[PDB]
Design an enzyme around this catalytic site. Structure first.
Site, PDB file in Angstrom:
ATOM      1  N   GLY A 146       2.823   5.943   9.913  1.00  0.00           N
ATOM      2  CA  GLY A 146       4.217   5.797   9.572  1.00  0.00           C
ATOM      3  C   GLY A 146       4.868   4.505  10.020  1.00  0.00           C
ATOM      4  O   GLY A 146       6.017   4.262   9.651  1.00  0.00           O
ATOM      5  N   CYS A 175       3.982   1.292   9.378  1.00  0.00           N
ATOM      6  CA  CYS A 175       3.874   0.144   8.487  1.00  0.00           C
ATOM      7  C   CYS A 175       5.244  -0.231   7.932  1.00  0.00           C
ATOM      8  O   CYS A 175       6.118   0.622   7.709  1.00  0.00           O
ATOM      9  CB  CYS A 175       2.848   0.491   7.393  1.00  0.00           C
ATOM     10  SG  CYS A 175       1.214   0.354   8.092  1.00  0.00           S
ATOM     11  N   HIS A 214       0.809  -1.218   0.000  1.00  0.00           N
ATOM     12  CA  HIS A 214       0.000   0.000   0.000  1.00  0.00           C
ATOM     13  C   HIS A 214       0.842   1.268   0.000  1.00  0.00           C
ATOM     14  O   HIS A 214       0.245   2.349  -0.022  1.00  0.00           O
ATOM     15  CB  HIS A 214      -1.014   0.022   1.160  1.00  0.00           C
ATOM     16  CG  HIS A 214      -0.435   0.197   2.532  1.00  0.00           C
ATOM     17  ND1 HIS A 214      -0.081   1.430   3.045  1.00  0.00           N
ATOM     18  CD2 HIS A 214      -0.235  -0.701   3.533  1.00  0.00           C
ATOM     19  CE1 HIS A 214       0.351   1.279   4.287  1.00  0.00           C
ATOM     20  NE2 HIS A 214       0.250   0.001   4.615  1.00  0.00           N
TER      21      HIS A 214
HETATM   22  C1  LIG Z   1       0.843   2.463   8.043  1.00  0.00           C
HETATM   23  O1  LIG Z   1       1.812   2.987   8.504  1.00  0.00           O
HETATM   24  C2  LIG Z   1      -0.456   2.432   8.847  1.00  0.00           C
HETATM   25  C3  LIG Z   1      -0.282   1.758  10.215  1.00  0.00           C
HETATM   26  C4  LIG Z   1      -1.534   2.064  11.133  1.00  0.00           C
HETATM   27  C5  LIG Z   1      -1.752   3.545  11.175  1.00  0.00           C
HETATM   28  C6  LIG Z   1      -2.224   3.952  12.565  1.00  0.00           C
HETATM   29  N1  LIG Z   1      -1.808   2.772  13.496  1.00  0.00           N
HETATM   30  C7  LIG Z   1      -1.392   1.648  12.584  1.00  0.00           C
HETATM   31  O2  LIG Z   1      -1.044   0.624  12.988  1.00  0.00           O
HETATM   32  N2  LIG Z   1      -1.464   1.669   8.091  1.00  0.00           N
HETATM   33  C8  LIG Z   1      -2.754   2.240   7.615  1.00  0.00           C
HETATM   34  O3  LIG Z   1      -3.044   3.380   7.788  1.00  0.00           O
HETATM   35  C9  LIG Z   1      -3.675   1.291   6.817  1.00  0.00           C
HETATM   36  C10 LIG Z   1      -3.467   1.537   5.328  1.00  0.00           C
HETATM   37  C11 LIG Z   1      -4.322   0.557   4.480  1.00  0.00           C
HETATM   38  C12 LIG Z   1      -4.349   1.057   3.047  1.00  0.00           C
HETATM   39  C13 LIG Z   1      -3.674  -0.844   4.540  1.00  0.00           C
HETATM   40  N3  LIG Z   1      -5.023   1.556   7.200  1.00  0.00           N
HETATM   41  C14 LIG Z   1      -5.461   1.180   8.561  1.00  0.00           C
HETATM   42  O4  LIG Z   1      -4.704   0.706   9.340  1.00  0.00           O
HETATM   43  C15 LIG Z   1      -6.945   1.472   8.956  1.00  0.00           C
HETATM   44  C16 LIG Z   1      -7.883   2.196   8.147  1.00  0.00           C
HETATM   45  C17 LIG Z   1      -9.252   2.174   9.030  1.00  0.00           C
HETATM   46  C18 LIG Z   1     -10.482   2.691   8.853  1.00  0.00           C
HETATM   47  O5  LIG Z   1     -10.761   3.364   7.658  1.00  0.00           O
HETATM   48  C19 LIG Z   1     -10.257   4.614   7.542  1.00  0.00           C
HETATM   49  C20 LIG Z   1     -11.545   2.470   9.894  1.00  0.00           C
HETATM   50  C21 LIG Z   1     -11.262   1.800  10.982  1.00  0.00           C
HETATM   51  C22 LIG Z   1      -9.866   1.221  11.188  1.00  0.00           C
HETATM   52  C23 LIG Z   1      -8.925   1.407  10.261  1.00  0.00           C
HETATM   53  N4  LIG Z   1      -7.633   1.083  10.118  1.00  0.00           N
END
Ligand SMILES: *[C@H](O)[C@H](C[C@@H]1CCNC1=O)NC(=O)[C@H](CC(C)C)NC(=O)c1cc2c(OC)cccc2[nH]1
Ligand SMILES: *[C@H](O)[C@H](C[C@@H]1CCNC1=O)NC(=O)[C@H](CC(C)C)NC(=O)c1cc2c(OC)cccc2[nH]1
Lengths: 306, 306
Positions: free
Chosen positions: B143, B145, B41
């Site tokens: 950040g 991931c 991603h």
């Molecule tokens: C990457 O660094 C990040 C790690 C994540 C961010 C905050 N704490 C963590 O562990 N990953 C993300 O932001 C991912 C990205 C997707 C494209 C794989 N998204 C999520 O973890 C995420 C998105 C949502 C949501 O929709 C907005 C609703 C509820 C939970 C949730 N988690």
């Protein structure tokens, strides 16, 4: 989100660890520049070790009585001296992996990471606090002495702890890197008693804010209190007094969450009088006191180092 | 003595961490030999991610669309490909700090260390377990991931986890280093629900043995139980079934202590029905389940690495 007991990354410290052998005693040392720091009780035999005179024991040694192994590489010792409870072994080579570093003495309530070692080799890393009775609640076996505790600030390793002793209660005692013990302990083979321990109130409050920041709010109430009414309850429960110092350096967290420090004190009071009634906070069924306010800010905003 | 949640020393992994940028999305990658592994991603734009087609998105990329920074040094990407949910970035330089390493997929109940990173830089290290619902209870900010989880056996890093997702309950989801998720999660911007979690019964029992080994015996009883009469009470309390495989893996600890596995099962039974009555075990007021039997043996016998 999430909140864990987190340790500093340990790579700068692993590259400093060595093995020190004098006679049949082996423990760990710390190699920085051309000096290796270790606990002086390495020069003891089992009989000296009951009530030694270290000055005497050291006058009786030469450089060749100390074997220092940095992995396979045996380092040549070219000088030695004692600074309080640590030995300093001058070696003919500066450690190429020497990081930026300081030697620091921490106060009670502050936290640090411990890199527990045996025969010169890292076994693991965990986070600890210097308790108010100047003990640490560690995990240490025979051979661990000379393992160090540390913090990393930006690029700099701040060494604050070297391990010497286990007390009969199963807690641990040590020195700073100038060899001065924390608390009233001595490096002898005797059963030694620590003062009564107390709870680090300011850290409990910091962890309560980490809780709020992560969505645990069930313990909050509409109430507030004065610092003096709060310390009255604090004494009843073996908590350290809360100071204005303490209130102040919780400001950042208070502001981030919207909860005044003395509102959160009022929640701690009710938790203390009423218990947690089988609920949990941040995955714990006890009030946790080994996170400082800066630990909480670091982790709840992603501070990095390098 | 003493018993702590211990992570592996992190230096062998610290030297593999790098930064990966595509467009304005930045996260962490893992550089081993001449390949950089990261969450796919990273190739998403903020709008792509509600439901992207990563095969479409990646065919639309060239090598020059990826910026890989090992500190200051920008690495040249010379090839790219995707394996399930991880991108594999071919670079023109083999990492000089590459450790002996394996890629491993772990089962539920097993533990590992997490080196949390941001912009390529280590922030901290903690120990986690793969929960029975395939989540981990982590601590991760935006950040993070591409941060990895790992075990060390002797000199070899076995990577088992790469971080991608935070679920709405505040726990975390990710992949193995072949890019396959643990559990039923997908890498998109959606609220995703994990199954109900259960307690890793075998780890609780091991931790009860860690207790005994460290002098907490208050919970022991004269009684014993059958593996089935024990499993009846466990289901009632959301504990995983205990197998004879599990019983067998507790053999060493059982032997060290003199307490048969099913005598200890009879002690866990009473703890579940009656609670801990304000007592603690190893400093905890909850039954701890993120130590495996081999975590307990390792720490209570000082096994090292290098
Ligand atoms: C990457 O660094 C990040 C790690 C994540 C961010 C905050 N704490 C963590 O562990 N990953 C993300 O932001 C991912 C990205 C997707 C494209 C794989 N998204 C999520 O973890 C995420 C998105 C949502 C949501 O929709 C907005 C609703 C509820 C939970 C949730 N988690
Ligand atoms: C060095 O590695 C070791 C660390 C210690 C061993 C077990 N877990 C630990 O943390 N340090 C010692 O063994 C020191 C040596 C002294 C001379 C500095 N001894 C103690 O920690 C110690 C001695 C006694 C004791 O004397 C009979 C009675 C009760 C407790 C106790 N602890």
């Amino acid at each position: 989100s999430g909140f864990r007991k987190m340790a500093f990354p340990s790579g700068k410290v692993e590259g400093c660890m060595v093995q020190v052998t004098c006679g049949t005693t082996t423990l760990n040392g710390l190699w920085l520049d051309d000096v290796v720091y270790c606990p002086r009780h390495v020069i003891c035999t089992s009989e000296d070790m009951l009530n030694p005179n270290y000055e005497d024991l050291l006058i009786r040694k030469s450089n060749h009585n100390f074997l220092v192994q940095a992995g396979n590489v045996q380092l040549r010792v070219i000088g030695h001296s004692m600074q309080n409870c640590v030995l300093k072994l001058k070696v003919d080579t500066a450690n190429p992996k020497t990081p930026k570093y300081k030697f620091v003495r921490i106060q009670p309530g502050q936290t640090f990471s411990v890199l527990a070692c045996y025969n010169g080799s890292p076994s693991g890393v965990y986070q600890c606090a210097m308790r108010p009775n100047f003990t640490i609640k560690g995990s240490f076996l025979n051979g661990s002495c000379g393992s160090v505790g540390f913090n990393i600030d930006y690029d700099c390793v701040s060494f604050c702890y070297m391990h010497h002793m286990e007390l009969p209660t199963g807690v641990h005692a040590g020195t700073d890197l100038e060899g001065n013990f924390y608390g009233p302990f001595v490096d002898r083979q005797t059963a030694q008693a620590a003062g009564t321990d107390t709870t680090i109130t300011v850290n409990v409050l910091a962890w309560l804010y980490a809780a709020v920041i992560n969505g645990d709010r069930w313990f909050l109430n509409r109430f507030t209190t004065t610092l003096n009414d709060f310390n009255l309850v604090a004494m009843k429960y073996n908590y350290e007094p809360l100071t204005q110092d303490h209130v102040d350096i919780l400001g950042p967290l208070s502001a981030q969450t919207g909860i005044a420090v003395l509102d959160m004190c009022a929640s701690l009071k009710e938790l203390l009088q009423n218990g947690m009634n089988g609920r949990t906070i941040l995955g714990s069924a006890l009030l946790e006191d080994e996170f400082t306010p800066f630990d909480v800010v670091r982790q709840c905003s992603g501070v990095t180092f390098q």
